[PDB]
Design an enzyme around this catalytic site. Structure first.
Site: not given
Lengths: 43, 119, 233, 246, 240, 245, 231, 232, 227, 216
Positions: J39-41, J56
């Site tokens: 889980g990233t932006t 990303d």
């Protein structure tokens, strides 16, 4: 009859001696034990 | 009520399988919810159809589904069940029960025919 | 068909399907069984093509369990299926008792199954008449003989297959009580060869004792068939 | 024996149960024409009872007699065949439309509905367990691209595209006749082509059935881009079109 | 009810009717030969001439591989053969999955016979119209070969044939066959009996196909013959 | 000729002989009149084949049933199939008010029963339903409506329909005058005259024993109610006096 | 040609009549329901001298207080006796008192007639003769394949039962004691035996009023009751 | 001829055959007669006796208080139907704590008749029953093999049913509003006419039910008194 | 009540499926050539009424990115077989993350067809499918019959006058042939047995290239190749 | 319903062999290795007649549903990968069967039903959007199965900064280049603010898409 079965299915309105009933609780195997927490006069 | 029915069968311990811890109480866990994952959905579909259209539609659907399902190979070799897929309208859809696989062990083929259709 | 009575009563109170199973049994190969004291010799007719066929694969004197043993005549695949059922049932019974399966129980079970196939829809009769030999819980040798109709009865010396009546009459005329092992094997060989050509390759006789089913060596069979050929003339 | 009874291939092919079902559809002799224009699709049929044992009577509300039905809102249909089988196929098409709308989240297309009904009739034909539906439909619909679409299937299950077609008795020579009318269309606002397609369909039915076709024996319906909702045109407007044609 | 075929039903005297007609289909197929040799198990087959445009390369429609140590060949309907070979593959791989050993061929032929007997006895569906020639190698009894049929019966065979002109092939195998036979001699015997059954003097290379299973270096290895080695074998056969 | 032995099988010339066997069976069974009136509707059931049986209790065998105390349903075919279809109508109304709380509209009920009767006429092992059922109702705003599913599964809206023996004669008799303006109270005399004249078995004495009725009109607040015998008897006397002359 | 359940023109099930045609072929058995008890006997039809004569017995015990005799198809009859004793001991499980003879023959009848869908496929071609003692004395019963069960004072089943039932009608009398019942049964048997009445060629089981136990008579008892017969 | 092979095939005249053969099977049964009054319904009947050694086969079966029936056909069908109505009556008195409507029970059994005659692989019941009761009024009902139930003032099944039907029709007006003894006498005279063979204690099956009198078979002494009364 | 209507007749031959082959003998031609730079499938689609939309009546369909399909039979069986073949292709795709090989799909469809021939109370299918495709193992062209037997064909014809069409194809076919020559031979073979004048909208041609996706040639392309 | 039992027996699905062993193991008190939380932006926005997603990484978050439908996931890697493969292949099978352009609404409905069938067990957040016959549409699926047609969406661990930047600098009728600049102004800023890798940009046009994995 099959007619009554489908009628009870759509309407959402649904016992020999040697058959053993069980609780609808999440874990029936411990059900009596849970009941033993509530009281002990019955058990 | 539940837990099958005692009938003095006398064959309680088999040489093919062992009893489950829950026997047939079927305690609500993730495998129990996934077991009734397709029966509940088709129950909802039959509810919708025979409610809005009339219970004769549910009757026709169940008889057609049983008839096409009755047309299948004997137990053993897996049956394609294409006609069932056309009738239930799941041929357009690919779902988790289609892909994946279960590998399955101790029962002779004749015992499977006895268990499947009561001979 | 599924849920369809294949066998039904005829106008003259007979099950024609069970009758067809009976002449199907009679068209099969012969098999003889004798009992005495605490052992029971068992023999079957062997039919193999010389120079091409493997005699080792063709097995007829299988053993069902530690003690009981079964011979058969007629359909071989039906015999194999019922043998798998009976072996699984013997292990089920030995699981519940922790004691060896007696001959009477497995004979009754075979009779029950062969009756069931003559009374259920979508199943034809088993085209065999197996005869079981083994020791009871009392540890006394006994032999039973089932049929496609599901009838069973205890026997002292019985035969099945093609030309069964001639072998039955010969055994009824010649059988004695409390015989020796060599005498029993000689009587079984003579009984099967009464309706089979006199040759060593057409018999696979074995003797059942409480230890096990010991298969008779080829040299003994050769000596006995030569002795029978000498005695015939 | 029993080759022609069940859906069995029979000698030299020619599955005969399908042909008997097609003949049973033809025996009802309710001619129903469908025509596809441009941003419009007129479907026209006859308000007459199917030929059978019973007969029409004076004490009968003739408006209730109808062969044109609505699947959901935009895609209409017209079954010609047996009484029960026609409405059963209408309900099956409704069930397929409900399946598509519930699962895919948008309205069913005429092509997808026709192929689904063709598959269900295929299951009926291949399985000799159940009788074949003797009712040939005629589906119309507006696609997502705002174009008309005409479609038709049979008890054989041959779903195919069309521009002008007819179902019922005397369907062979009529294939030429509609083409001649399209020749008249071969040589405009939305209402102009709507009116032209409507009068062309009425003229097609008049030429095929070959009688006056009074206003109490026609049911006309159109789906166009102006409205897009399947609606039956009133009796007075049908009478106006009939007078204008004559 | 009136349209019932009544498959699982005895004849008036002693036999299952459909099982006979299935056997007649086995008598109306291309001949398949099977042999036992001192250094392998040979199983040739005769290719029916469907047309000259058939892709001869890698279209061995008679002999198939069930497992890394088991193969078979058919003398009946190929569509049934595909499904039955698939089920044989599934049983062999499930046995290797459960018990962690290579399948003995006796168990595999017993299980495929159980399939064919279930269709023979249970239900009303028609029986399986194909007969196999399963053969292979195992440590229990060395090299083995079997002969299944629609009736469910099976037995071992040092040398056998099925299909059209099976009597002539059996007669040829009865005379010219030896226990201590090398692989090349077995291949030449396969060519000879195939040519005798086909009635031609010179075998046609395109009209036959061959295979064997060698157990060299303590490892099973199946080799299926292609056109070049078939031509070489035929050339050596005609020159001897 | 083989094709006629199963409802599923199609005849060579596209007509299911079994369905006309149903039609013949119902046409050779008890008749059932019904029609519309200004005040309401009136459905009549005449049991002529019971004339030989002089054992039945007084007006106990009723062929006219009701659903929700709002809808009348009657028939002419076999009793058991009709009762099964009646219980299906009751079950449909049950499920409708359970899951929607509104009384079932009549077109919904007749459509569902029509497809239910048709749902047995496309299989092979279930006996097809032998019953021609007439459903009817009357509202003050909507006037009246009388449907009639045939055993094939063909539902049509009728102002008046007769099914059974002498159905052509009864339909000819009803069409003599327009019954839309004739009130329900006065139509009983005409119905008595038709059943006494058209049907040969019905004599003067049998009119009161083997006949049934019910209306839905404004007098009973547009709801089910059988005719009281005090209303039938003057009509019977007037009809007998007229026919005697 | 026809299904397992199809009425004849005379309103008689074809399969039921064919089952009633098969019960005639079988071994003779005779029973007297005297006040003291039931004396259900049999034939012991020996196929050959090699028969062991221990596993082939016609008289089986449905329960300790019940006796019966089998006829017709034998494996089917064994299935009937097995189900009868299973439900009898089930009744003993639910209810303390031993099962009456009447209820047992109802269980047998509803076993016999379940072949119609109203699983089993064809009717049970067996004609049992159940007999035993309960709280209202001795009771003797019968169940043909048609299911019309009926109690009897004295009855006979098997092949050539016409002479047996005629002689029982011509000899049976009320208030007959147990020894009189024994000699009557043996006389009827000997007058329908084809061969001589030897000691080992007959099987008899007795359920007495006081004992209420299934006592199958041994060789000495059979010899005594054969010896006490008249000329 | 050809259409009687299965119970889902109608003749060219539109008529079943298996159902008609079941009706003929009912016609082959023994005789039974029942007569009502104002508040009393007698249900008598013969009892089949195969041979002199055999005691008679009992016909009457009591289903519930104020409910008892008589079989006139196949015994197994009678047993199954008696068990079903017994379970229905006991279930209704169990769950709701009241006596079951006789109309509801008659309609339920006739519904079962309909299900079992509709589908194939099934046979209609070869038995007819007098579902008689005193649910606050004397009633006699009759369910046929075809799904249908009828109600009468008096009834007869099979054997010499014509004589009983003629006598009951002749004396139908005396039956209403008569004493219990007169009703018993008339019903036993009807059974005697059915015999056309004489009534005895064993073969006669007199049974009485009504106000302040649940279903109970009359004792041997009173039955002998009534059979003496009809004899003279 | 489940029994097989396709039952072994006397002298074998499995007669019921043979009736299906007669339907395959009574159907319009549908051929295909496996070229050295691709694989071609061609068909004769009729003009029964002259009011049909030519686009709507598809016969040469696409299953995967490099798998086409054409048939010779009734259209409903083609539709259901196409739908199940597509479902099996996506099933392989989720199982293994790659385009389904032609051999595996051919085996699966053969098993399904044989299943339906053997299954109780259902007739066989009435068409002879003609699979084609391209994969890492090169080009492929198979033919599943109603009996279920699959043949690794190189150039085949099924329909009316299939023997003469196959003979004409064999007379003018070689192992090393370009895609254009293969298309021309397909057009010539279709025009050989037409019983009329062949022109635009009467045929449909599908081609799978050595690397491009399986594309169905448009009407203008077919007209250009006609000249 | 016996046919559904036959369908369950013949077909496969989720096997459940080792529930009890895992229950014993977790009750016995041993720490087991953690899940790959990818889980990233991630963000997306509805630009001028084309959706412009953003994410990303070297795990490429931009996944392919159709030629005019892309998506970006945030949660458990296996759940996202399998659900995305299932949705892509379901839409491909529908496109083959029906022969019509894919629609974002069908994808939204299928994802909503699939995620609603599993209440919270499947950690699966997707920002699926694309161009269909009804123009560009962007959606904001959550792990509870609640879609919503928003003009711009930003999900992930560092979603707050991206959402704030998008709310600050969003305008209608925006140019595609300005859309890419705003996409980096969200994602790059969220990477450098929140606690990586390379940004990912892909304009979702009705036809002829383009993927830029080395965007920055």
């Amino acid at each position: 009859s099959f007619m009554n079965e489908i009628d009870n299915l759509i309407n959402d309105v649904e016992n020999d001696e040697l058959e053993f009933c069980v609780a609808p609780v999440n874990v029936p195997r411990n059900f009596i034990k849970y009941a033993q927490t509530q009281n002990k006069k019955l058990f | 009520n539940y837990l099958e029915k005692l009938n003095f069968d006398f064959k309680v311990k088999d040489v093919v399988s062992i009893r489950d811890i829950n026997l047939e109480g079927k305690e609500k866990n993730i495998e129990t919810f996934h077991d009734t994952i397709l029966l509940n959905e088709e129950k909802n579909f039959l509810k919708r159809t025979g409610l809005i259209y009339g219970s004769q539609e549910v009757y026709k659907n169940i008889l057609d589904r049983e008839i096409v399902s009755l047309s299948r190979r004997l137990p053993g070799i897996k049956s394609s069940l294409l006609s069932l897929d056309i009738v239930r309208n799941t041929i357009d859809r690919i779902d988790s029960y289609e892909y994946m696989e279960k590998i399955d062990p101790l029962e002779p083929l004749s015992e499977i025919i006895e268990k499947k259709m009561n001979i | 068909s599924y849920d369809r009575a294949i066998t039904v009563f005829s106008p003259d109170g007979h099950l024609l399907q069970v009758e067809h199973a009976l002449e199907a049994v009679k068209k099969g190969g012969c098999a003889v069984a004798i009992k005495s004291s605490n052992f029971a010799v068992l023999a079957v007719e062997k039919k193999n093509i010389p120079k091409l066929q493997n005699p080792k694969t063709t097995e007829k004197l299988i053993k069902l369990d530690e003690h009981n043993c079964l011979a058969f005549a007629g359909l071989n695949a039906d015999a194999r299926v019922l043998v798998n059922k009976t072996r699984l049932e013997c292990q089920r019974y030995y699981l519940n008792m922790d004691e060896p399966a007696p001959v009477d129980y497995i004979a009754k079970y075979v009779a029950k199954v062969q009756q069931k196939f003559t009374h259920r829809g979508g199943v034809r009769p088993f085209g065999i008449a197996t005869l079981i030999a083994g020791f009871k819980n009392n540890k006394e040798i006994c032999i039973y003989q089932t049929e496609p109709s599901g009838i069973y009865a205890a026997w002292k010396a019985q035969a099945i297959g093609k030309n069964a009546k001639i072998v039955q009459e010969f055994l009824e005329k010649n059988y004695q009580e409390n015989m020796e092992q060599k005498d029993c094997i000689f009587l079984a060989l003579k009984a099967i060869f009464e309706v089979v050509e006199l040759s060593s390759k057409n018999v696979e006789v074995a003797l059942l004792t409480e230890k096990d089913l010991t298969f008779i060596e080829e040299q003994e069979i050769n000596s006995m068939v030569e002795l029978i050929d000498q005695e015939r003339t | 024996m029993y080759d022609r009874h069940l859906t069995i291939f029979s000698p030299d092919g020619n599955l005969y149960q399908i042909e008997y079902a097609i003949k049973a559809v033809k025996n009802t002799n309710i001619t129903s024409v469908g025509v596809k224009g441009e941003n419009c699709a007129v479907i026209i049929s006859q308000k007459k009872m199917a030929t059978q044992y019973i007969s029409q009577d004076k004490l009968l509300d003739y408006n209730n007699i109808t062969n044109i039905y609505n699947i959901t809102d935009e895609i209409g249909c017209s079954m010609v065949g047996m009484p029960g089988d026609c409405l059963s196929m209408v309900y099956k098409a409704r069930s397929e439309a409900s399946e598509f709308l519930y699962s895919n989240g948008y309205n069913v297309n005429a092509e997808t509905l026709c192929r689904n009904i063709c598959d269900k009739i295929q299951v009926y034909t291949q399985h000799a367990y159940m009788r074949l539906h003797a009712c040939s439909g005629m589906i119309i619909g507006i696609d997502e691209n705002n174009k008309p679409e005409l479609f038709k299937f049979d008890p054989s299950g041959f779903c195919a595209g069309y521009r002008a077609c007819v179902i019922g008795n005397k369907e062979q020579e009529s294939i030429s006749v509609l083409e001649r009318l399209l020749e008249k269309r071969k040589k405009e606002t939305i209402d102009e082509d709507i009116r032209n397609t409507t009068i062309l369909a009425i003229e097609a039915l008049q030429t095929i059935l070959a009688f006056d076709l009074k206003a109490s024996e026609i049911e006309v319906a159109i789906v166009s881009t102006k409205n897009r909702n399947f609606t039956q045109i009133s009796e007075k407007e049908i009478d106006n079109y009939l007078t204008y044609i004559a | 009810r009136r349209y019932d075929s009544r498959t699982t039903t005895f004849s008036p005297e002693g036999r299952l009717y459909q099982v006979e007609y299935a056997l007649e289909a086995i008598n109306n197929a291309s001949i398949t030969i099977g042999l036992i040799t001192k250094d392998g198990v040979i199983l040739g087959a005769d290719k029916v001439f469907i047309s000259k445009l058939i892709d001869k390369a890698n279209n061995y429609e008679k002999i198939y591989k069930i497992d890394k140590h088991i193969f078979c060949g058919v003398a009946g309907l190929n569509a049934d053969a595909n499904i039955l070979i698939n089920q044989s593959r599934l049983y062999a791989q499930r046995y290797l999955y459960n018990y962690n050993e290579v399948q003995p061929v006796s168990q595999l032929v017993v299980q495929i016979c159980d399939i064919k007997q279930s269709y023979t006895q249970y239900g009303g569906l028609r029986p399986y119209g194909v007969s196999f020639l399963i053969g292979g190698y195992d440590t229990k009894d060395g090299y083995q070969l079997y002969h299944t049929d629609p009736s469910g019966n099976y037995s071992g065979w040092f040398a056998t044939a099925i299909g059209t002109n099976n009597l002539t092939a059996s007669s040829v195998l009865k005379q010219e066959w030896k226990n201590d036979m090398t692989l090349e001699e077995g291949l030449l015997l396969a060519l000879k009996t195939l040519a005798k059954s086909t009635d031609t003097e010179i075998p046609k290379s395109e009209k036959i196909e061959l295979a064997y299973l060698t157990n060299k270096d303590g490892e099973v290895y199946q080799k299926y013959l292609t056109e070049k080695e078939i031509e070489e074998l035929i050339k050596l056969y005609t020159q001897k | 000729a083989g094709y006629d032995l199963s409802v599923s099988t199609f005849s060579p010339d596209g007509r299911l002989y079994q369905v006309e066997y149903i039609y013949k069976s119902i046409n050779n069974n008890n008749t059932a009149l019904c029609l519309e009136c200004k005040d309401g509707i009136i459905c009549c059931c005449i049991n002529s084949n019971m004339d030989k049986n002089k054992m039945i209790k007084k007006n106990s065998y009723n062929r006219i049933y009701h659903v929700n105390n709002n809808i009348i349903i009657t028939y002419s075919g076999f009793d058991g199939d009709a009762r099964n279809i009646i219980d299906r109508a009751r079950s449909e109304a049950n499920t409708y008010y359970y899951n929607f709380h509104t009384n079932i509209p009549l077109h919904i009920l007749v459509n569902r029963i029509s497809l239910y009767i048709h749902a047995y006429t496309l299989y092979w092992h279930m006996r097809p339903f032998a019953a021609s059922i007439i459903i009817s109702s009357f509202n003050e705003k909507d006037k009246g409506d009388i449907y009639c599913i045939e055993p094939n599964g063909a539902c049509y809206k009728y102002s008046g329909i007769v099914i059974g023996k002498n159905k052509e004669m009864f339909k000819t008799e009803i069409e003599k005058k327009d019954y839309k303006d004739i009130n329900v109270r006065d139509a009983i005399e005409d119905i008595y005259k038709f059943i006494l004249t058209s049907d040969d078995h019905m004599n003067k004495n049998n009119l009161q024993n083997l006949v049934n009725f019910s209306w839905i009109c404004k007098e009973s607040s547009y709801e089910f109610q059988n005719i009281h015998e005090e209303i039938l008897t003057p009509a019977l006397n007037k009809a007998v006096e007229y026919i005697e002359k | 040609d026809r299904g397992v359940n199809t009425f004849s023109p005379e309103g008689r099930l074809f399969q039921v009549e064919y089952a009633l045609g098969a019960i005639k072929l079988g071994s003779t058995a005779v029973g007297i329901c005297v006040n003291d008890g039931v004396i259900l006997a049999s034939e012991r039809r020996i196929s050959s001298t090699l028969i062991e004569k221990d596993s082939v017995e016609k008289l089986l015990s449905i329960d300790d207080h019940i006796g019966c005799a089998m006829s017709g198809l034998m494996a089917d009859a064994r299935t009937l006796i097995d189900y009868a004793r299973v439900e009898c001991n089930h009744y003993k499980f639910i209810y303390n008192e031993n099962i009456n003879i009447k209820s047992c023959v109802e269980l047998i009848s509803e076993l016999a007639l379940d072949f119609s869908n109203l699983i089993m496929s064809r009717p049970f071609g067996v004609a049992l003769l159940i007999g035993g003692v309960d709280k209202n004395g001795p009771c003797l019963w019968y169940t043909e394949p048609s299911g019309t069960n009926t109690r009897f004072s004295a009855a006979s089943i098997g092949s050539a039962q016409e002479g047996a039932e005629l002689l029982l009608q011509e000899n049976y009398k009320k208030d007959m004691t147990f020894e009189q019942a024994e000699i009557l049964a043996l006389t009827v048997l000997r007058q329908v035996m084809e061969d001589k009445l030897s000691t080992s060629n007959v099987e008899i089981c007795a359920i007495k009023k006081s004992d209420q136990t299934f006592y199958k008579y041994n060789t000495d008892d059979i010899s005594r009751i054969i010896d006490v017969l008249p000329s | 001829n050809l259409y009687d092979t299965d119970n889902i095939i109608y003749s060219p005249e539109g008529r079943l055959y298996q159902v008609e053969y079941a009706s003929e099977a009912i016609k082959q049964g023994t005789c039974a007669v029942a007569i009502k009054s104002k508040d009393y319904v007698v249900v008598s009947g013969l009892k089949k006796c195969i041979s002199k050694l055999s005691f008679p086969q009992e016909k009457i079966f009591k289903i519930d208080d104020y409910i008892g029936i008589s079989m006139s056909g196949i015994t197994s069908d009678a047993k199954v139907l008696t068990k079903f109505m017994q379970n229905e009556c006991l279930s209704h008195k169990f769950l709701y704590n009241e006596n079951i409507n006789i109309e509801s029970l008659v309609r339920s059994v006739a519904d079962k008749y309909q299900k079992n005659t509709q589908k194939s692989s099934k046979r209609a019941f070869g038995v007819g029953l007098m579902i008689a009761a005193y649910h606050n009024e004397p009633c006699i009902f009759e369910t046929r093999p075809n799904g249908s139930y009828f109600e009468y003032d008096a009834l007869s099944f099979g054997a010499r049913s014509h004589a009983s039907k003629t006598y009951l029709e002749k004396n139908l007006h005396l039956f209403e509003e008569c004493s219990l003894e007169e009703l018993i006498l008339h019903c036993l005279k009807a059974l005697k006419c059915s015999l056309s063979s004489e009534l005895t204690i064993s073969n006669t099956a007199l049974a009485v039910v009504g106000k302040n009198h649940p279903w109970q078979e009359i004792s041997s002494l009173q039955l002998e008194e009534y059979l003496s009364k009809v004899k003279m | 009540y489940s029994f097989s209507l396709t039952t072994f007749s006397p002298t074998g031959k499995l007669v019921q499926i043979e009736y299906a082959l007669n339907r395959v003998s009574s159907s319009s031609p549908a051929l295909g050539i496996r070229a050295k730079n691709g694989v071609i499938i061609a068909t004769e689609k009729k003009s029964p009424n002259e009011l049909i939309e030519e686009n709507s009546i598809f016969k040469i369909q696409q299953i995967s990115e490099h798998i086409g399909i054409v048939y010779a039979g009734m259209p409903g069986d083609f539709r259901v077989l196409l739908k199940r073949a597509r479902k099996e292709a996506i099933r392989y795709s989720l199982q293994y993350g790659s385009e389904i090989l032609v051999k595996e799909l051919v085996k699966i469809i053969a098993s399904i067809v044989q299943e339906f021939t053997q299954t109780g109370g259902v007739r066989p299918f009435g068409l002879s499918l003609l699979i084609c495709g391209v994969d890492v193992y090169g080009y492929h062209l198979y033919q599943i019959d109603p009996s279920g037997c699959y043949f690794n064909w190189m150039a085949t014809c099924v329909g009316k006058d299939y023997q003469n069409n196959m003979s004409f194809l064999e007379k003018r076919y070689n192992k090393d042939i370009e895609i254009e020559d293969a298309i021309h031979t397909a057009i010539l073979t279709l025009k050989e047995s037409y019983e009329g004048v062949l022109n635009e909208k009467n045929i449909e041609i599908g081609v799978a290239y050595d690397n491009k996706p399986f594309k169905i040639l448009t009407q203008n392309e077919i007209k250009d190749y006609l000249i | 319903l016996e046919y559904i039992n036959i369908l369950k027996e013949e077909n496969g699905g989720y096997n459940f062999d080792n529930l009890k062993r895992n229950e014993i193991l977790k009750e016995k008190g041993v720490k087991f290795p953690q899940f790959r939380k990818t889980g990233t932006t991630i963000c997306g926005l509805v630009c001028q007649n084309a959706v412009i997603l953003g994410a990303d990484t070297n795990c490429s978050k931009l996944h392919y549903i159709s030629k005019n439908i892309w998506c970006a996931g945030a949660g458990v890697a296996g759940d996202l990968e399998h659900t995305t493969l299932w949705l892509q292949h379901n839409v491909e099978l529908h496109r083959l069967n029906t022969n019509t352009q894919p629609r974002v609404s069908m994808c939204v409905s299928r994802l909503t039903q699939e995620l609603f069938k599993y209440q919270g067990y499947k950690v699966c957040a997707i920002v699926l959007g694309g161009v269909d016959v009804n123009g560009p549409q962007l959606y904001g699926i959550h792990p509870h199965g609640s879609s919503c047609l928003l003009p711009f969406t930003a999900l992930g661990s560092g979603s707050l900064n991206a959402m704030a930047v998008l709310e600050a600098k969003y305008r209608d009728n925006m140019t595609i280049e300005e859309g890419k600049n705003l996409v980096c102004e969200a994602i790059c800023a969220g990477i450098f603010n929140d606690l990586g890798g390379n940004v990912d940009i892909c304009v979702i046009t009705k036809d002829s898409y383009q993927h830029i994995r080395p965007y920055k």
